[PDB]
Ligand binder design. Structure first.
Ligand SMILES: CC(=O)N[C@H]1[C@H](O[C@@H]2[C@H](O[C@]3(C(=O)O)C[C@H](O)[C@@H](NC(C)=O)[C@H]([C@H](O)[C@H](O)CO)O3)[C@@H](O)[C@H](O[C@H]3[C@H](O)[C@@H](O)[C@H](O)O[C@@H]3CO)O[C@@H]2CO)O[C@H](CO)[C@H](O)[C@@H]1O
Ligand SMILES: CC(=O)N[C@H]1[C@H](O[C@@H]2[C@H](O[C@]3(C(=O)O)C[C@H](O)[C@@H](NC(C)=O)[C@H]([C@H](O)[C@H](O)CO)O3)[C@@H](O)[C@H](O[C@H]3[C@H](O)[C@@H](O)[C@H](O)O[C@@H]3CO)O[C@@H]2CO)O[C@H](CO)[C@H](O)[C@@H]1O
Ligand SMILES: CC(=O)N[C@H]1[C@H](O[C@@H]2[C@H](O[C@]3(C(=O)O)C[C@H](O)[C@@H](NC(C)=O)[C@H]([C@H](O)[C@H](O)CO)O3)[C@@H](O)[C@H](O[C@H]3[C@H](O)[C@@H](O)[C@H](O)O[C@@H]3CO)O[C@@H]2CO)O[C@H](CO)[C@H](O)[C@@H]1O
Ligand SMILES: [K+]
Ligand SMILES: [K+]
Lengths: 256, 257, 257, 258, 256
């Protein structure tokens, strides 16, 4: 039972923050990057290393202590540091003799969500015989059915650099108290197209005029921004990610 | 059917929520969601695809609470489930270049869904009328050369799962008054998958007179195809890859004469 | 014609529903919907395409119930039929790479459709004015070098099937006041077909005064081209591939003076 | 000009309908609508294009019915590229895309542009290379300096002559052109696919934010266009710009001014 | 406190100008171009020369002297000289035997902002061990966190030919008194798509009907228009940039 919005200057608040990407971080110098990608010798023997697997990012932001609950109404968001992908001089692979370095490009996933509780995930596997590595949280008791839909694979995005992007998507059968948005663009030569502006707002209210309601006075923000792959001079390839800005406006709502 | 007023009251609305799994061919016990690798006939007349090489339409007939009243489908939420699985570029695929990652799934895609109060109605069109379609599939019969453009003999109902090959059949635009259907074919061998997910998008199913699909016999028919492209193995062989599709439909009771 | 009021009543509306088959050249009895394989001339002056290598505009003149009143075309639903046929990549096609699937139909496409109350009016434009067009086609006559940009002598009516080559003719934008036309040329050898289907989309045919095409002599004219791209067989030779188009047009009776 | 009321009555409106042919270079008597094959200089400083290799802006000055204070005001535009299907000729001395394949279609860099004004389009010069030597018979930025590569305000002109103003040297001057409406798109890159739409159902409104269209001085309407569709590649691999004509239909009304 | 707009003939003014691009200008003939791009031998040794680094452009425009403040209400903007990119004959690299020169293409960044004070920047680095050259203003005290987000890297776009595009982006946590817009399109074969028209206006008012308010009677305009790279006959590549036109309409606003 959602009742009226509380008004007055005291009745609104704002959360502003950035979520850093979690791409694998193969050493102390390579934050924002994965380990170079290797290919298994057989389909059955797919065994990716942990630092080769991008993961979902999540932040739980505490809100002013308040029945009233904070209701998330609007979102401004964007990728931070888009211009960094213009570095084409840092030991990349030349496009042709005497040319500049190939820029970051190829398969991308750009995703963000705002909820009054953890994002709910459903597991789907490209290859059910993939061995996922220690330190990740992955679909357990995988069967061949996991390659299309196995409803045993349910989880909460409740830990950082744990949930690999390739294993998990938002569960469309749940997430009633979250709003999520994502685009996968696959293909080795796909160009990054990244828009920035401080003039665009997303409205988080549902068709009944109600936004995510924050349980325990916590706001859940989640993101993935795999921008593509950086190709080294040797030809080896690493995922490259960027941080995402969130600004969320909230208001006090009475509930029964 | 004269369509009359909508019922109101708590008893008068219901919701259907489910997923349709893809039917890409499943050539062995480990390859659900994939087809057999594609081979090419030496002539048009010798084209004889194996069944497990042919993606088919998916369909589910969903029973509704028993009810003259009929359930009317009013809105749809839908999306492709598992889009991020296509980021697996390390599972014995074909390197894009020396020391590179594996080619991701790409190329010819067909993304399609329908919601109706009866089975989707189909019209057959053949790329090559001399293609010999395999046992266990339901395909256009008595094909002639006119079947390559339009033969009105090829009518059917999407009334069985794992049966109707995608490449032979399309929604019949001369029929389907009681269904709403939506699809996109993006052809070309290097086409990138572009797959959007969100829980904030709704499609309204009402027609221009405010009437949605009316569920004959209290059954709702959901249909889908989501061929996302092809996976390329190290050897260079290629297999179709598909994903499941989520459907959430809202229905209301409607009186008819 | 001064346009006056619309007639009302059950008897005042009618519908046309049909399909137009493509006319790609049909080089033999097995290849309806295809052109002859494409060959290239040695020089501009020796360009000499055979008839079965030239796609042509499709047209149907549909008689309407005999009626001063005139039938007025108000709305259109239209759709390319057989889009999924283009997923046959196993039928004598050139492999994309060693051990890969066959190439899908792709490259240059023209998708076009028109609805009118008289024949579509055409203007001739030639890529190369010295092209010798074949017997059995209707093509710009007395061509000059000016015909490569605009020669106002080249006027015609789309009044016959398998006759007017797509490459020679376009809708005349200086005329066609009693027709609504819509077309897209997408050029390039690797262009991917993007073909959308749905039964939920309507095009309104009314002009800015609220008047649709008015059907002279109680005839409705539908025209189409759907060259989807080229099919490449295993030898590398290429052929245009086209598909049928569905039309459904709603009409009403309009009084004129 | 204080703009006052619009005149009404059967006599108060008129239409202009015409087409502008492209001016691509026309290297011989058989190649109207094409440029000369494109060649490339051996050094940056020695860039020296032939006249017949340079596409130019097209312009028409259209006399309107005599008014005299009343002026013709341009209110709406329908426009269309004429002959889009000609680009389906892939059998006329083209380079085959692969062994036994069809000819490569026209593709690559394009510029599609049109304007409607009550006076000549005003141009600003910008040079890719200020040391480019532009040929006799063209009108081009004079006294070019290195600043001409980004913005040299000396390079002002009117589009007042055909086969004269090379497309690559000139753009509409956004600091002027208040009595003109202009629209254009450059799509660059050697494999760019032409995407050419045609319909007789699309109208562009020419009124500004105050409800005032271009006012035609001396009762003349100015139409300008460029439609470089891409390049045609012949059997030898050499490449020529290909252009097409553009249709204009403009509706005008009588407006009183003080 | 923002109060009423002033009316009357004299209560409005316009600013019209162009900002020239700053791509690096490696010699006296190459305004609008960068130095040819070279690639470091190792990731760690990335050290771009100054004239190889495009920078943000900025102009501070004095307004009629005026509490009342000038409020920016509308913008028209356009890239100037788009057709110059049709020069495919000036010692470029033929796309194939006997073919024309490859046009300007590949990675682009088109960006513009209008503010009543300097654009505020946040630093993000592709490679934190990049040695940025003397004469540029770059993120100082870089750590591996600077590859994703280091909140120490704050600056104002207060100088021309100084702030490298690849190091800096607008700071979404600040910039309340500016409206900014940008698009990064990455990839070496990306085609430039450049539209021009004098019929398009952007409204600069925020959700409360308030545009940027010009402190000290100064209007701040900023831009980047890296259109892509030109490829020379040898294969060497140089960034190519173009000027940007700005027209801004302002009105007088009373504030307390
Ligand atoms: C070419 C090669 O050996 N590749 C190994 C890789 O080895 C590391 C490094 O290679 C590169 C690469 O993959 O090309 C160099 C590149 O600049 C790096 N890029 C970035 C953005 O950091 C990447 C990257 O760090 C990794 O791919 C991340 O996974 O690495 C080699 O040049 C380096 O060679 C050293 C020799 O090992 C050493 O004996 C000799 O004395 O000195 C050279 C130079 O220091 O070794 C690096 C490994 O420590 O390593 C990855 C996974 O770790 C794979 O094994 C590649 O196959
Ligand atoms: C290269 C080849 O022989 N291809 C056959 C295919 O043979 C199977 C397998 O090949 C692959 C492939 O096509 O590259 C390996 C790949 O990882 C698999 N991918 C996935 C996602 O499962 C595919 C896939 O399973 C099939 O293409 C689905 O149709 O298969 C071969 O490497 C394997 O080789 C065996 C030899 O034949 C055998 O002599 C030797 O003793 O052992 C090796 C290793 O097992 O055989 C596989 C099964 O036959 O088979 C398909 C059947 O449609 C086609 O004939 C391909 O042309
Ligand atoms: C091929 C080469 O040496 N490249 C050097 C570059 O040398 C300069 C110039 O090369 C070019 C180039 O291809 O990079 C020619 C090109 O047309 C120029 N393009 C433009 C748009 O100006 C570019 C450009 O100016 C620079 O790349 C900017 O960074 O330069 C050479 O042709 C030229 O060679 C001279 C010899 O030095 C001289 O011994 C010989 O007798 O005469 C020739 C011709 O004058 O030298 C130019 C350097 O002054 O220089 C850049 C560094 O700026 C890099 O080192 C490239 O790798
Ligand atoms: K006319
Ligand atoms: K001005």
């Amino acid at each position: 039972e959602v009742l009226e919005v509380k008004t007055g200057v005291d009745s609104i608040t704002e959360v502003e923050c950035f979520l850093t990407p979690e791409m694998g971080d193969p050493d102390e110098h390579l934050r924002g990057f994965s380990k170079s990608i290797s290919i298994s010798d057989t389909f059955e023997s797919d065994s990716p290393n942990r630092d080769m697997l991008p993961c979902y990012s999540v932040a739980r932001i505490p809100l002013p202590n308040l029945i009233l609950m904070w209701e998330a109404v609007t979102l401004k968001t964007e990728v931070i540091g888009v211009t960094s992908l213009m570095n084409v001089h840092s030991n990349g692979q030349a496009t042709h003799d005497n040319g500049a370095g190939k820029p970051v490009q190829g398969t991308s996933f750009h995703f963000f969500s705002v909820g009054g509780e953890a994002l709910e995930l459903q597991g789907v596997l490209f290859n059910y015989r993939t061995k996922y590595p220690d330190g990740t949280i992955f679909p357990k008791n995988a069967t061949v059915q996991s390659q299309v839909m196995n409803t045993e694979h349910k989880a909460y995005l409740d830990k950082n650099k744990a949930y690999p992007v390739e294993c998990w998507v938002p569960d469309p059968t749940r997430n009633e108290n979250t709003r999520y948005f994502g685009t996968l663009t696959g293909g080795e030569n796909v160009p990054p197209v990244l828009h920035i502006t401080n003039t665009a707002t997303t409205v988080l209210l549902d068709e009944f005029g109600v936004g995510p309601l924050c349980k325990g006075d916590n706001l859940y923000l989640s993101a993935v921004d795999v921008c593509g792959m950086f190709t080294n001079r040797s030809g080896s390839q690493q995922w490259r990610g960027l941080s995402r800005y969130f600004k969320v406006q909230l208001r006090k709502r009475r509930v029964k």
